[PDB]
């Protein structure tokens, strides 16, 4: 079945500038009736998808004239001539020429801003959680930009990849940065069998990782 490959997956833009998004199909999506059912949808935060463009290049009624689509065969592009705040969201291309109908992975159109280093904070399990026999170590990585970041947990100096719940906010309304929370959950017995706990963040704003650590005994 048809793979729809969108490029890029993240598109930072300045307001008032043009945006363009590419969608490539794995095979021709010209239908047997000769129509090409290539559509573009926008999904804003907390909203359902809305149709922008159909049959490659027809703008759907009520869509601003800033939006346009082009392409043929397996190569398609959506253009936004001048991005406005209300255009930010996730754009999906979609083919409905062959079953199963298939979407692209989505392109997040976001507001470009200056690089910002994360403020990283590590939190031992609370006394109260330890009375329960679970123990969670929490690391917040706040107000960073760009969104690209890696977080690593180290227990007694060795990387730990199981026990982990990460969650992220969207671009902030005051400063256009992102934030992230990572929670590493162990049993109380396992927490107390180990001694150093480290959250390490890798981000383009520093050649070296940001390391926040504590020793359980201290």
């Amino acid at each position: 079945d048809v793979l729809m490959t969108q490029t890029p997956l993240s598109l930072p833009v300045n307001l008032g500038e043009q945006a363009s998004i590419s969608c490539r199909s794995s095979q021709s999506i010209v239908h047997s009736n000769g129509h090409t059912y290539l559509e573009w949808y926008l999904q804003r935060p907390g909203q359902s998808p809305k149709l922008l463009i159909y049959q490659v290049s027809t703008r759907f009624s009520g869509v601003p004239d800033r939006f346009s689509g082009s392409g043929s065969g397996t190569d398609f592009t959506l253009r936004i001539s001048r991005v406005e705040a209300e255009d930010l969201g996730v754009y999906y291309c979609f083919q409905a020429s062959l079953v199963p109908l298939t979407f692209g992975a989505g392109t997040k159109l976001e507001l470009k801003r200056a690089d910002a280093a994360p403020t990283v904070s590590i939190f031992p399990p609370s006394s109260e959680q330890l009375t329960s026999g679970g123990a969670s170590v929490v690391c917040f990585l706040n107000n960073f930009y760009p969104k690209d970041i890696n977080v690593k947990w180290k227990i007694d100096g060795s990387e730990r990849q199981n026990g982990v719940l990460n969650s992220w906010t969207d671009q902030d309304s005051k400063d256009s940065t992102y934030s992230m929370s990572s929670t590493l959950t162990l049993t109380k017995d396992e927490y107390e069998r180990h001694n150093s706990y480290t959250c390490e963040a890798t981000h383009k704003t520093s050649t070296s990782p940001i390391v926040k650590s504590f020793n359980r005994n201290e």
Binding site: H35, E39, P100, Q129, S167, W168, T183
Partner: protein
């Protein structure tokens, strides 16, 4: 034109999902529009499921076909979807989408109207109140001009919880992170960042309400 999805909200694994899409402002019969069901797993993209045409012809996503049944009741202006033996991977927003077209050009068709969606959460959990834990800094990290505190809201079901700081009086410098479902329960966290001279000199308390369990707890953040 409006589309409205309804569903159970929550199911246990192995149960049958029954969805309904109710249409208005136009007639399924007269318009001869097709209707699809589309879903979106939390923080993931869109997946097409099934389509039904005006004459009851049906198409399915091959990977879920054995578990899917699409139908309709043209007299009630409703389309239905059933999915048997749901499990964790079926937790998603389910959308109804009309495949409309202009006037007479039935070949020039597209998903012009979408419902608001109905959310499905699959869990074996009973209603469970959260454990709310105050997160004070490590016995050291109150040098520098600012201090960051947190609150961990762990092991609840179902959504939502309401979290505030100082009953909402502390609202700037807050990040409250989306809940994540893991092992049948939800966990959420929030951070608040203040000046180093604000805390611990002043009281900062996490307030967590869980409507489903009728619970409201406060957790003061205290120095370790």
């Amino acid at each position: 034109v409006t589309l409205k999805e309804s569903g159970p909200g929550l199911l246990k694994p192995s149960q049958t999902l029954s969805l309904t899409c109710s249409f208005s402002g136009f007639s399924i019969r007269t318009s001869k529009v097709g209707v699809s069901w589309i879903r979106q797993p939390s923080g993931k993209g869109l997946e097409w499921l099934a389509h039904i045409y005006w004459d009851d012809d049906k198409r399915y996503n091959p990977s879920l076909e054995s578990r899917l049944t699409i139908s309709k009741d043209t007299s009630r202006d409703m389309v239905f979807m059933k999915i048997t033996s749901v499990d964790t991977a079926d937790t998603a927003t389910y959308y109804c989408a009309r495949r409309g077209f202009y006037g007479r050009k039935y070949e020039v068709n597209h998903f012009d109207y979408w419902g608001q969606g109905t959310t499905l959460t699959v869990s074996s959990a009973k209603t469970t109140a959260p454990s709310v834990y105050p997160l004070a800094p490590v016995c050291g990290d109150t040098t520098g001009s600012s201090v960051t505190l947190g609150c961990l809201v762990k092991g609840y079901f179902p959504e939502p919880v309401t979290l505030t700081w100082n009953s909402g009086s502390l609202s700037s410098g807050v990040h409250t992170f989306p809940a994540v479902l893991q092992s049948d329960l939800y966990t959420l966290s929030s951070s608040v960042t203040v000046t180093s001279s604000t805390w611990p000199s002043e009281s900062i308390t996490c307030n967590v309400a869980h409507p489903a369990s009728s619970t409201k707890v406060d957790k003061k953040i205290v120095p370790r």
